[PDB]
Amino acid sequence: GSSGSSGCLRQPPSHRKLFVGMLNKQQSEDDVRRLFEAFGNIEECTILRGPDGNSKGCAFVKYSSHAEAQAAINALHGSQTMPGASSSLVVKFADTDKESGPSSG
């Protein structure tokens, strides 16, 4: 059943990345690997490390599709609170075109 949508509007965006922050300088790529994937499959993972060297409490994680992404987000972001931080984990859809834009130039 449920065949035939005949309704295309505000269709979802195009991006398989997720920006995670409010992390602790203890966890490792692995920890975040299993944890995340624990819900929705992951395509790639890359921990962020500022020039200083010590993790900046951030990392880039990708998923197979949107649905899965949201699952991990709600299941993670706003759920627990990384050690040290007072605010629940922060996981949002990572953007690609930040600097660029249709700005009237």
From Swiss-Prot:
**Function according to Swiss-Prot or TrEMBL:** RNA-binding protein implicated in the regulation of pre-mRNA alternative splicing. Mediates exon inclusion and/or exclusion in pre-mRNA that are subject to tissue-specific and developmentally regulated alternative splicing. Specifically activates exon 5 inclusion of cardiac isoforms of TNNT2 during heart remodeling at the juvenile to adult transition. Promotes exclusion of both the smooth muscle (SM) and non-muscle (NM) exons in actinin pre-mRNAs. Activates the splicing of MAPT/Tau exon 10.
- From the Swiss-Prot or TrEMBL record, state where the protein is found: Nucleus; Cytoplasm
State the organism's lineage. Answer: Eukaryota, Metazoa, Chordata, Craniata, Vertebrata
Question: Member of which family?
Answer: Belongs to the CELF/BRUNOL family.
> Tissue specificity, please?
Ubiquitous. Strongly expressed in the cerebellum, hippocampus, amygdala, temporal and frontal cortex and frontal lobes.
Its encoding gene is what? CELF4
Q: What is this protein called?
A: CUGBP Elav-like family member 4
Organism, by scientific name, is Homo sapiens (Human)
Q: Which positions fall inside the RRM domain?
A: 16-96
Q: Write down the superkingdom of origin.
A: Eukaryota
